[PDB]
Amino acid sequence: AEETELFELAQAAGGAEVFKILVDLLKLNVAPLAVFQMLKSMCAG
Amino acid sequence: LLGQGDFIRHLMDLLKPELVRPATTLYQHNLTGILETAVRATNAQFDSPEILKRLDVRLLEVSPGDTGWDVFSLDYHVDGPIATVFTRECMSHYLRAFNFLWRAKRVEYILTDI
Amino acid sequence: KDFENQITELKKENFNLKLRIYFLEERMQQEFH
Amino acid sequence: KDFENQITELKKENFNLKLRIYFLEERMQQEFH
Amino acid sequence: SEFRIHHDVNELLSLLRVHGGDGAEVYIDLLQKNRTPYVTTTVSAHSAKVKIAEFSRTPEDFLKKYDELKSKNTRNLDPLVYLLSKLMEDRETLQYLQQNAKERAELAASAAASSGPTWQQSLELTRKMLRDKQSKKNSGQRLPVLPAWVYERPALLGDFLVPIGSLPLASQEAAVVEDLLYVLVGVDGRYISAQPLTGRQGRTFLVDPNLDLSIRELVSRILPVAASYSTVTRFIEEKSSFEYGQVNHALAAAMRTLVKEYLVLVTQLEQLQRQGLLSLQKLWFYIQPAMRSLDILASLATSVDKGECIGGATLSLLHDRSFSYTGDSQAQELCLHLTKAASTPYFEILEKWIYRGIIDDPYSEFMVEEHELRKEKIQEDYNDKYWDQRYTVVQRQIPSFLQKMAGKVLSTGKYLNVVRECGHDVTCPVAKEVVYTLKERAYVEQIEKAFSYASKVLLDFLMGEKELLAHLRSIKRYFLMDQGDFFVHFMDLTEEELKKPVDDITPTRLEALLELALRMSTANTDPFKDDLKIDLMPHDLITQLLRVLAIETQQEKAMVHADPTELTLSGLEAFSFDYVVTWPLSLIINRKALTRYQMLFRHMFYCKHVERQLCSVWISNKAAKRFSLHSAKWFAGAFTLRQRMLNFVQNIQSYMMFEVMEPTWHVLEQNLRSASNIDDVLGHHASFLDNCLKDCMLTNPELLRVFSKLMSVCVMFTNCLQRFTQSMKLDSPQLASSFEATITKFDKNFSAHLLDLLARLSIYSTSDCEHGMASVISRLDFNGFYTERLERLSAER
Q1: Which residue from E147, E202, E265, E501 has the highest number of Cβ atoms inside 10 Å of its Cβ?
Q2: CB neighbourhood size of E79 (10 A)
Q3: How far is CA E516 from CA E507, E513, E519, E613, in A?
Q4: Taking Cα atoms as reference points, which of E624, E666, E625, E651 lies closest to residue E786?
Q5: What is d(CA C21, CA D16) in angstroms, rounded to the nearest whole number?
Q6: Chains B and C physically touch (3 or more Cβ atom pairs below 8 Å)
Q7: Which residues of chain B does C2 touch, with a Cβ-Cβ cutoff of 8 Å?
Q8: E110, E500, E643, E702 from E716: Cα distances, Å
Q9: Buried-state track E234-256, b at ≥16 Cβ within 10 A, e below 16
Q10: Contacts of E770 in chain B (CB under 8 A)
Q11: How far apart are the C-alpha atoms of E418 and E455, rounded to whole Å?
Q12: Taxonomically, which superkingdom (chains C, D) (predicted)?
């Protein structure tokens, strides 16, 4: 799980929504290019 | 690239009614059937079923106004190292050669009949 | 020849999904009884 | 566009079938708990 | 699971406040074909880190975490770091995510307010937790764990737990050398002191004030290696824990072997020390030879401990370190040696798992662990795991080099665990000693031969003990007749049982009928008969088949969730079949797979019974040839209706018999002939099943309902004909009310239903073209006498 380590990474990111569904995609080992396209699309909504 | 003329004229003859036939009424299964029949009929039967796999088709565009012979086309797949050699631009070049050859050969059958 | 191939893929996807639905329904019914 | 129609039908059917199978899998996992 | 996108990505679209656009559904689809069991993140990670720090407004925490996250050495921190850097690149994407998140954050906030390091403690918590973890993994087993007395006797290794006010400079150097030698032996200094390790440490020195500033500076180099050696002894003890692992014990013992070299050098210097012929600069010269090596050795130990490296964690850390220990060529080779040795601690089990086909998992170091999976309950269960969970894969536990072949190794280990579950557990004759070596392709090289041998052995064992050839030459009689006498007895005997409703059927009478029909034919050459039986379902084949076809389509609760108890127990559709094959002996047919193989019997035998009823009606209709059928208004419209319905039913059967049947059956035969692995045979059978049901056309709820309506119309017409025959031959109530030559109207309704079914076939041949639909249209349009009219009604859209 490492929910605490995911929050540690988020605080490391130091931004302004755990976002660990993406860490689940990392567990599935999704690709960075599709990840970037998905991030841009989810940002647009 | 419009090779064996037996199969080339087989395609032109089998698509003349299809070209005359409505674009929406294109019998897609009839296309593959005509391809297989031409392969087995003409000396293209010497061509392997691997060539039949490289044999591909694809819709051209949304343009029902153009003629049937002007709209008929056939594709040519490239696999792995063949994919890396026959580039997408190269694939388009081969497809355009096939398209010009179709505009030539359907018209050629039409003119040989004319 | 390769433009009509997507139909077979759709057919296999739909058949697999229908079989999965039938088996999943038999499993959920087993969980319900 | 016949290939396009078959492909679009395959995409919609696959999306719906995947949604149905995912709902069945999630409901069977939850019922397994 | 396989649909984990529904849990993550679909909720990413919904919860992320992104409902417009594609949301994270298309993102789920993008990551689905991009999600690998392994990691292929080769990238200039230094470049990505530089980009992140460059865009880091507060780069202190960014760089700190860039180091801290590696402290745990977690899973694929590089992808997250790259994501955190590349997302900072697109302020529009960042601002849009801020819109997607901050508004929901405000909503949640509003909804909320309405209503020191002790080595002893750090290691004791670790030891107790690891004992509990090893007990959990044991799941009812003991442990060769370290003893409580091993934890006791504090400083069990004898761990490191003089007036020099006006000493001459030479005497000061000598006394400092004595103190430092005692420290190197883990002993107290002469004029100075050394506080113990502040948890993860060696000895926190406390230099003597009388130690010269130059003397203190020279000693400063020594103190690093001293603390390194003390912490190294502590780490060796830590790896000596059985909780650390037997492989950790092997690593610690190899370290102890080199530690002898440390004490050896201590004594080598002690030779001159007792001789009194050493010097501070001479000592520094000798220390430089291995003072760095001391810290180098403690490095890998701290890497394992800080990552709590269990399983292939320390293995991957070690292999990466060996790939980076270059420059320090000595460490580049020493770590390789440790790798090669300690591989065998797991590689023996790996060889055991790979070679022996039996993975030893006292610690479950091999990723393949023989997960509990009762193979017997696979056949009778609609959902089974034994075929896939007789050996689970611990993807988290894998070595650096092992991770490459692991997937191929996963397949090979699955085959080997299959051989073990086959009773004939065996070692693969390829027992290339699993051990660590620089050749990585060599690790998979002999692995290729081993996997090939495993697959070949599986194929041979299937052709032997499984012997699926007879299991199919006999199943041909099952659900497909393939011989008139195969199902002739079943049709001839089940008549009374089916006449008895499903509530009225007698199971004992059915059993007797089955046994007698089993002995009633000469086709008993098939020996697998005992593996097969009959059965029944508390719902019609339609009752569940159409419910699945309308999979929450139009009758989610109207008919699919409507219990068959709403209707009555009817003998015919409720009937079913039974068959089974053991776990090792082909538990292939799980109740989902077994149901798929079974229901073809139901559909085929339904059509068979309808044709039998039609043939019985026609045979009883043998007297009408002795006169003119014109005077048979209630018995001659039957002739026209039979002509109109033979094309609907009897002719409908021929398309299944030849076009549908030959393709799937021959595909199964040829694909099984080309099948070499279990997956290949599964593909051949899956073709025989899916493609056969596809040509059966039993998965389109609208078209299947139309065909069922036509078949039911035919069945009702046969029933009305039989009723009119019973009410007329006995005439020589309800049966006479079925038809009074109104069976002419029933035949007209059958013709209309046939027109609708031909329209459905035309719809299949138009919206799907196909060859089977074109054949359905071709079989309908046999002649225009009943097809030119159908063609006009087809134009009647």
Answers
A1: E202
A2: 22
A3: 14, 5, 5, 23
A4: E651
A5: 12
A6: yes
A7: 56-58, 75, 77
A8: 66, 18, 16, 20
A9: bbbbbbbbbbbbbbbbbbbebbe
A10: 29
A11: 10
A12: Eukaryota
Search chain C and give the residue with CA nearest D9: C10
**What's the CA gap between E437 and B1, in Å, rounded?**
53
SS3 E314: helix
Q: Which has the closest alpha carbon to E680: E689, E671, E688?
A: E671
Residues 1-33 of D with CB under 8 A from B: 1-4
Contact (CB, 8 A) for E94 and A43: yes
HSE-CB of E425 using CA atoms within 13 angstroms: 10
Are residues E692 and E472 in contact, defined by beta-carbon separation less than 8 angstroms?
no
CB-based contact, D18 to chain E, within 8 Å:
yes
- Which position has the token pair 């566009």? D1
Determine the residue type at E207. V
| D19 near C CB under 8 A | no
- Cα distance between residue E165 and residue E191, in whole Å: 9
Point out the residue among C9, C10, C31 whose CB comes nearest to the CB of D31. C31
CB atoms within 10 A of CB E795: 7
Question: What is the distance between the alpha carbons of residues E51 and E55, in angstroms, rounded to a whole number?
Answer: 6
CB contacts < 8 A, C to E, total 43
Tokens of E177: 């050398």
CA-to-CA dists, residue E73 to E68, E183, E304, E401, E768, angstroms: 9, 32, 9, 17, 54
* Contact residues, chain E, for B28 at CB < 8 Å: 769
Resolution in A: 6.8
| Ordered DSSP codes for E144-165 | -PPPHHHH-SSSTT-------T
Instruction: Give Cα D8 distance to the centre of its chain.
Output: 14
Distance CA E590, CA E598 (A): 11
Residue type, A6: L
Residue D13 in contact with partner chain E when CB distance is under 8 A = no
